[PDB]
Design a protein around this ligand. Structure first.
Ligand SMILES: Nc1ncnc2c1ncn2[C@@H]1O[C@H](COP(=O)(O)OP(=O)(O)O)[C@@H](O)[C@H]1O
Ligand SMILES: [Mg+2]
Length: 310
């Protein structure tokens, strides 16, 4: 289905960074165009302006709440039976985990709440929805249950399962609480947190929405995959792993946007293939720092993003 790309510039961590030797200029959304443009320039050559176009660009002023205002309609399509993928891409420090897991705010916590509200609002229509989830990480192309792991693709239902991975029902906000509180401490920057490892691995929060209509007899199944990718910044075979996995993902998303998708070329794209094909909806989130000390990695992330939307 639809493939969208959003860029997100996080607030500068003052006293640590500044924009003294670079310039990132974001233009307002243009309806004439349908996209939003931004310009990046390095002080050592202000004549060379790198322009980038996206479906939407969030700046230092956009909060997580602001970000979700553009994500809500996407994730609610899962109640219609659509699969959805939301990827957070960017260098370590750009704000991927904050965007996806910030307590109560992140795309994941917000998505769960939004779905819950929709479930109840749909209850008055004969719909009974059930929600279950899994939280895993892909490190060095191996799957680890964060809550033997083999990927089982069901050509019949066009759904995917992973053997021996914990799955939890989400029928209470209390449950969502323990899980999310757990996910955050695992991936968020905390002194006693393995962010070193988290920066070198992909983390995927999978949510399955199964709805049945007692009277209408209709049924519905949609899966949401919320990915917090490994840092894209420029253990050699391991770095090559991260590098090739991220490059593979780009090839696939790009290919998918085209009018032989290399799904099997990486553990992540192979796992998510059913949620990436068909009328599935994909949202690529490119996180970048506004600071001059990261301008080069920033241009790399923005280049990856431009490819993925061609
Ligand atoms: N949108 C944001 N608003 C406020 N702080 C942010 C935002 N994004 C990131 N940060 C902060 O920036 C630092 C980088 O965070 P993080 O999301 O963990 O980066 P990454 O996951 O890309 O390595 C953290 O201290 C985080 O709290
Ligand atoms: Mg992180």
């Amino acid at each position: 289905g639809n493939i969208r790309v959003y860029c997100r510039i996080r607030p500068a961590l003052k006293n640590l960074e500044n924009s003294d030797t670079s310039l990132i200029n974001v233009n307002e959304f243009d309806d004439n165009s349908g996209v939003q443009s931004m310009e990046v320039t390095k002080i050592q050559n202000t004549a060379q302006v790198h322009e980038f176009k996206f479906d939407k660009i969030f700046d230092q002023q956009d909060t997580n709440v602001d970000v979700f205002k553009e994500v809500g309609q996407l994730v609610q399509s899962s109640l219609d039976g659509y699969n959805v993928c939301i990827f957070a891409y960017g260098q370590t420090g750009s704000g991927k985990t904050f965007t996806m897991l910030n307590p109560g705010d992140g795309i994941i916590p917000s998505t769960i709440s939004h779905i819950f509200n929709w479930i109840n609002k749909l209850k008055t229509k004969g719909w009974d929805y059930k929600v279950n989830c899994e939280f895993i990480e892909i490190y060095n192309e191996n799957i680890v249950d964060l809550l033997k792991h083999e990927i089982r693709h069901d050509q019949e239902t066009k759904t995917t399962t992973i053997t021996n991975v914990t799955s939890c029902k989400l029928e209470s906000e209390e449950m969502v609480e323990i899980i999310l509180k757990k996910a955050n401490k695992l991936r968020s920057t905390a002194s006693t947190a393995s962010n070193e490892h988290s920066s070198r691995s992909h983390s995927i929060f999978i949510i399955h929405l199964s709805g049945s209509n007692a009277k209408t007899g209709a049924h519905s199944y949609g899966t949401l995959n919320l990915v917090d990718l490994a840092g894209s910044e420029r253990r050699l075979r391991e770095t090559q792993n991260i590098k090739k996995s991220l490059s593979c993902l780009g090839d696939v998303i790009h290919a998918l946007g085209q009018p032989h998708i290399p799904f099997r070329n990486s553990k992540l794209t192979y796992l998510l293939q059913y949620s990436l094909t068909g009328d599935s909806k994909t949202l690529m989130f490119v996180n970048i720092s506004p600071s001059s000390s990261h301008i080069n990695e920033t241009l790399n992330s923005l280049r990856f993003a431009s490819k993925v939307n061609s």
